Write a protein that binds this ligand. Structure first.
Ligand SMILES: Nc1nc2c(ncn2[C@@H]2O[C@H](COP(=O)(O)O)[C@@H](O)[C@H]2O)c(=O)[nH]1
Ligand SMILES: Nc1nc2c(ncn2[C@@H]2O[C@H](COP(=O)(O)O)[C@@H](O)[C@H]2O)c(=O)[nH]1
Ligand SMILES: [Mg+2]
Ligand SMILES: [Mg+2]
Ligand SMILES: [Mg+2]
Ligand SMILES: [Mg+2]
Ligand SMILES: [Mg+2]
Ligand SMILES: [Mg+2]
Ligand SMILES: [Mg+2]
Ligand SMILES: [Mg+2]
Ligand SMILES: [Mg+2]
Ligand SMILES: [Mg+2]
Ligand SMILES: [Mg+2]
Ligand SMILES: [Mg+2]
Ligand SMILES: [Mg+2]
Ligand SMILES: [Mg+2]
Ligand SMILES: [Mg+2]
Ligand SMILES: [Mg+2]
Ligand SMILES: [Mg+2]
Ligand SMILES: [Mg+2]
Ligand SMILES: [Mg+2]
Ligand SMILES: [Mg+2]
Ligand SMILES: [Mg+2]
Ligand SMILES: [Mg+2]
Ligand SMILES: [Mg+2]
Ligand SMILES: [Mg+2]
Ligand SMILES: [Mg+2]
Ligand SMILES: [Mg+2]
Ligand SMILES: [Mg+2]
Ligand SMILES: [Mg+2]
Ligand SMILES: [Mg+2]
Ligand SMILES: [Mg+2]
Lengths: 21, 100, 52, 38, 118, 95, 354, 110
RNA sequence: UCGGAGUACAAAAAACCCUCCGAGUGAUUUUAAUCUAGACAAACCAGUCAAAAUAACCAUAACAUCACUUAUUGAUCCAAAAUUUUGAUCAACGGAACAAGUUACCCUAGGGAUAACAGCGCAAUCCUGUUCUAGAGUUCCUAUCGACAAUAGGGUUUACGACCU
RNA sequence: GCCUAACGAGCCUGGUGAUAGCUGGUUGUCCGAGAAAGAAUUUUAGUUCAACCUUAAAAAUACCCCAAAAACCCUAAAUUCCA
């Protein structure tokens, strides 16, 4: 939950990217 | 282009003094929709420090920020959730720099 | 791609029919179903055509 | 009913007006003016 | 939207000068609250109305004695803008069983034990 | 509903209620789920079972059906091999 | 509103930027090892183990047992490397290994296992089976000395009693033979205790065979304080535990309060507390051997109850709580017709006045 | 005009039983459209991603590591693309059983 | 009529002739059963989950899968089959078994709950002033104007709202 | 158009106390409690349910509710559940 200290524990999209001069 | 209070619009530099640049930038500041000033680094720092000094040496114990955060007199009923952050200095699109 | 509704009767002897959807461009359908009367896997064949 | 952001200064509630009047800034005033003090 | 208000903790952190300003003991907190409702509950939210009702402050200008525990301090914080809170002072101690019928509560907050003897 | 008939002066009952409803003597009304015979090829087995199950009625519908029916349909019936004779009565109702 | 984390975040150490130059694992099993390693750490948030009983996490168990044997680490390592080198020097072993046709001396491997690391596995198995929790409730001991117990079920048929084995009461009717390596200068005591099976007191245990002042290994020569009693688990409650506790003592312990009469067929007299026993005689004896087996009811337990104990065989069963049902409603809306059957006392028709 | 069909009632996709609530067997703990809460101990998963208690007990919510099924190609690819020190975490809902499995009661002395 | 996202930022719900995507089904085989605790949702009707137990397949699964999977759908009655099922752009999608246009020849009961005139609110539009000078004015912003912009006011026009009738 | 001073179809009588979701009216005193709208509907000038409310009766928990707990790219006022 947003107001809990454990918010963002499950974030993983910043660890993998999947979307030269 | 939406513009908020406290944002720079045009930034200039070079081998020039502030007096002439202020002279020909006051016209642009006046013709802009929102109120605007021709400031420099020194002038911006001076006004920010003057605002900080006014806020620190204000004499009366009662301030908009303190009252809004403490919910004194139940004033949150007539206030807004954004007033806790605006501290009474911003009212809609108008900003009053002399409101501490 | 129009389908068809076909009623299949069990070949286990007991009278038990179920309706299933099938493609029009297919041959006569024949599958393996479960007959509650005998409780066994029984071959079912298309007997009637009901709905388009 | 007016929007939260308008062009006509959007006159406030009387309680808010009283709050701002009470919380108006009060500059400090020295006991004796120092201009032509020693 | 208008909802309830969470009061930040720094509001209820007294300054060292506040003790002398309000006449409180810097070491020992007082034991009992005297709470008197001043303002009306009209034009106030239903939660404030209910807190006033459950605090026994339905009638105005009638003091009520409460504990100084956080459980009731939470409700007093919720409706602190409608009440006046004072500490209950006992210069002559708690009223004994032989002095129950001769006591009074002064406007300045001391509960006298012998009031108009004889 | 005819509250006062023109021949006998009695209260009449609507036959649709008795044709599609059953009343237990305890006051409950039993009915069949609507649409239990419609498009069975299009429905899941669980949905078909739920439609096949018998269901009761709430207080408002029970009182409505009681108003529509007469006192002949609220009597105690002792049928021969009645399926619902065990359900005619209510047990262990703590109210 | 936001709240600051109450400690370090899990994935806050590695750098978000420049992921291409950051090393990655490509193996699901490798990730599995990493995840199982992480899951065992004491995190500051609510975890599965905290709610499902990690048993207060770490516990400083009190060790009441013989010191571990003192061996030379350097010499042991040198001999082990020498043995490994001499084994690897062979070529027939290499051929067998590559051809996948090589057998193992299972009896030998068990011998060295019981010699060097068997006591620790036995201690952890006792922990898992809950022997220490019910025998001392606060103490653990390592069975340093092996203890081989065996029943004789025929003329050439021997039933071993390992740690946690299952032994039939018919097989365990006779007294067993116990062997353990010991010099002819020490004294030992052996106790067979029935942990679960006391009909009256849940926290008490039964005695079955107590022999004291055993000279070295000859247990038959030592005096028996309590005559042997075959296991008698109840018919309903199955899989009781019987533990063989071996104590090594320095002095010749002599007592009169723990002595039992010759018949010793009274369950009131055969009531025991290993904690109290060890508290009474804690100064001399130290536990060094452990051998426990599971035991369920069979056709001989009724004979044991009848002929020996002179009572009626008690029969239990594993009953289950009645199914939960909500409060009955006056008008159950959209409920099946079988709703009234959930609150029916009996499936019989009651005619109140008719 | 040009925009049609935008009206549709909410599906009530949310949480039904919070932490500490005493639930019985079969109670729907929480319903969801995508996987927001994952089932854990004594919590079964329905065909519509709903979570229902399998035993009577107390509902708890925890943050735990996530090891996906090796047959799940998408999750396996995500795992194999994760960096070295990264471990996935998910919010799992558990039911802690309260009543014992059963009791041993004496029936008769034979 | 049904579904997804925003409005509706964090349990649920939440409207507009608000802004955008969609559905009225296809392909394939694993052709996906009975009975029953306890629950979600809900005015009602309807919609959803589901432990244990049963017969057939590994003697270790069966929730049919995919197309954003969420929507791919219709109540009674009544008609037809072979007794087990089926039948509606009933799409005005809680659906009357089957019915248009016109009335300035009109009538009746009401409505300022609702329009045309007027009034009223606002000032999009209209009208007045000032601030700002690049440009015209031969040079020269302000003699006369003055684009791009700023700010204040009036309630003459059209419109907007539907507050009194 | 005219058909006995009102004719898009005369007048009288009877059906007839026609029928109106529409307007108007609805007659003594005092006291107690007391409601501003979610869904269907040829339905939005109306009804039928739900939620509120009244009158009686059974019970036991009812509001206020600190921790702890409620998602993944960023996110405020604050919500839900709880001693
Ligand atoms: N097709 C169909 N017609 C029905 C149904 N129920 C009643 N009807 C009516 O039965 C009649 C059938 O006449 P048809 O249209 O076959 O000439 C129609 O008046 C129709 O409205 C139904 O379920 N399906
Ligand atoms: N629907 C509804 N009407 C109300 C309510 N209170 C008052 N009214 C109506 O308001 C009128 C009287 O106004 P009041 O005297 O309440 O100011 C009457 O027409 C009355 O029916 C209410 O709570 N709900
Ligand atoms: Mg300006
Ligand atoms: Mg407004
Ligand atoms: Mg070594
Ligand atoms: Mg929507
Ligand atoms: Mg809606
Ligand atoms: Mg509910
Ligand atoms: Mg099952
Ligand atoms: Mg319609
Ligand atoms: Mg409709
Ligand atoms: Mg609907
Ligand atoms: Mg004409
Ligand atoms: Mg008229
Ligand atoms: Mg109106
Ligand atoms: Mg006009
Ligand atoms: Mg006029
Ligand atoms: Mg007008
Ligand atoms: Mg007028
Ligand atoms: Mg306007
Ligand atoms: Mg104006
Ligand atoms: Mg020029
Ligand atoms: Mg005018
Ligand atoms: Mg009007
Ligand atoms: Mg209006
Ligand atoms: Mg005439
Ligand atoms: Mg009338
Ligand atoms: Mg109407
Ligand atoms: Mg009154
Ligand atoms: Mg009603
Ligand atoms: Mg809390
Ligand atoms: Mg509570």
């Amino acid at each position: 939950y947003r107001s809990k200290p454990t918010h963002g524990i499950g974030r993983y999209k910043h660890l993998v990217k999947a979307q030269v001069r | 282009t939406p513009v908020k209070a406290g944002r720079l619009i045009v930034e200039m530099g070079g081998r020039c003094e502030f007096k002439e640049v202020q002279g020909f930038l006051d016209l642009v500041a006046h013709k802009l929709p929102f109120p605007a000033k021709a400031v420099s680094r020194e002038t911006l720092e001076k006004m920010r420090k003057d605002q900080e000094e006014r806020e620190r040496n204000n004499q009366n114990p009662w301030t908009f920020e303190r009252i809004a955060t403490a919910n004194m007199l139940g004033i949150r009923k007539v206030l807004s959730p954004y007033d806790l952050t605006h501290k009474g200095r911003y009212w809609g699109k108008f900003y009053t720099p002399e409101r501490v | 791609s129009k389908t068809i509704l076909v009623k299949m009767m069990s070949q286990a002897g007991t009278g038990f029919s179920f309706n299933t959807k099938r493609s029009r461009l297919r041959e006569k359908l024949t599958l393996l179903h479960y007959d509650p009367v005998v409780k066994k896997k029984v071959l079912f064949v298309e007997q009637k055509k009901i709905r388009s | 009913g007016s929007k939260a952001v308008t062009r006509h200064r959007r006159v406030m509630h009387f309680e808010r007006q009283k709050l701002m009047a009470v919380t108006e800034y009060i500059p400090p005033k020295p006991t004796i003016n120092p201009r032509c003090l020693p | 939207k208008f909802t309830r208000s969470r009061i930040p903790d720094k509001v209820f952190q007294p300054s060292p000068e506040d003790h002398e300003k309000y006449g409180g003991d810097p070491q020992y907190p007082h034991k009992l609250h005297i709470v008197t409702r001043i303002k009306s509950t009209k034009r106030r939210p239903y939660w404030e109305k209910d807190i006033i009702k459950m605090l026994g402050l339905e009638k105005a200008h009638t003091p009520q004695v409460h504990k100084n525990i956080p459980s009731v301090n939470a409700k007093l914080k919720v409706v602190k803008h409608l009440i006046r809170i004072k500490p209950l002072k006992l210069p002559q101690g708690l009223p004994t069983e032989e002095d129950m019928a001769n006591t009074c509560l002064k406007s300045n907050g001391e509960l006298v034990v012998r009031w108009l003897l004889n | 509903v005819t509250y006062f008939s023109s021949r006998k002066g009695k209260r009449k009952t609507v036959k649709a209620v008795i044709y599609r409803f059953l009343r237990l003597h305890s006051g409950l009304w039993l009915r069949r789920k609507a649409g239990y015979k419609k498009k069975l090829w299009k429905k899941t087995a669980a949905r078909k079972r739920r439609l096949r199950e018998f269901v009761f009625c709430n207080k408002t519908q029970s009182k409505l059906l009681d108003k529509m029916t007469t006192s002949f349909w609220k009597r105690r019936n002792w049928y021969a091999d009645d399926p619902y004779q065990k359900y005619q009565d209510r047990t262990n109702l703590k109210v | 509103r936001r709240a600051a984390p109450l400690g370090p975040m899990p994935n806050e150490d590695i750098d978000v930027s420049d992921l291409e130059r950051l090393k990655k694992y490509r193996s699901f099993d490798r990730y599995r090892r990493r995840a199982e390693q992480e899951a065992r750490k004491p995190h500051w948030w609510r975890t599965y183990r905290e709610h499902f009983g990690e048993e207060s996490g770490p516990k400083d168990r009190v060790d009441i047992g013989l010191p571990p044997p003192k061996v030379s680490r350097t010499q042991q390592l040198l001999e082990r490397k020498q043995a490994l080198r001499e084994l690897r020097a062979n070529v027939e072993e290499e051929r067998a290994a590559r051809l996948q046709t090589a057998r193992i001396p299972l009896e030998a491997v068990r011998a060295e296992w019981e010699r060097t690391c068997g006591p620790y596995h036995k201690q952890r198995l006792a922990e898992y089976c809950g022997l220490y929790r019910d025998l001392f409730h606060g103490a653990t001991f390592v069975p340093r000395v092996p203890l081989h117990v065996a029943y004789a079920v025929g003329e050439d048929d021997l039933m071993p009693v390992y740690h946690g084995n299952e032994v039939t009461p018919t097989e365990a009717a006779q007294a067993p033979e116990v062997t353990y390596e010991a010099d002819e200068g020490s004294l030992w005591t052996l106790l067979l205790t029935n942990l679960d099976g006391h009909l009256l007191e849940p926290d008490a245990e039964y005695v079955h065979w107590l022999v004291t002042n055993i000279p070295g290994n000859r247990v038959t020569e030592g005096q028996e304080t309590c005559p042997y009693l075959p296991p008698f688990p109840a018919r309903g409650s199955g899989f009781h535990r019987f533990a063989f506790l071996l104590f090594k003592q320095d002095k010749r312990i002599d007592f009169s309060g723990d002595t039992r009469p010759s018949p010793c067929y009274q369950l009131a007299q055969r009531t025991f507390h290993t904690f109290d026993f060890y508290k009474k005689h804690q100064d001399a004896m130290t536990p060094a051997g452990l051998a426990f087996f599971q035991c369920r009811w069979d056709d001989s337990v009724t004979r044991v109850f009848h002929q020996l104990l002179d009572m009626r065989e008690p029969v239990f069963e594993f009953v289950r709580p009645p199914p939960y049902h909500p409060k009955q409603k006056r008008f159950p809306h959209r409920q099946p017709l079988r709703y009234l059957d959930r609150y029916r006392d009996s499936h019989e028709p009651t005619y109140g006045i008719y | 005009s040009k925009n049609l069909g935008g009206k549709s009632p909410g599906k009530r996709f949310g949480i039904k039983k919070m932490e500490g609530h005493y639930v019985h067997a079969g109670n729907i703990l929480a319903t969801q459209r995508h996987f927001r809460w994952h089932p854990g101990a004594h919590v079964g998963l329905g065909k519509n991603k709903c979570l229902y208690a399998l035993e009577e007990g107390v509902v708890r919510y925890t943050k735990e590591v996530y090891v996906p099924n090796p047959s799940n190609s998408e999750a396996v690819d995500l795992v194999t693309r994760l960096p070295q020190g990264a471990v996935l975490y998910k919010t799992f809902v558990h039911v802690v059983p309260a009543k014992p499995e059963g009791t041993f009661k004496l029936v008769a002395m034979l």
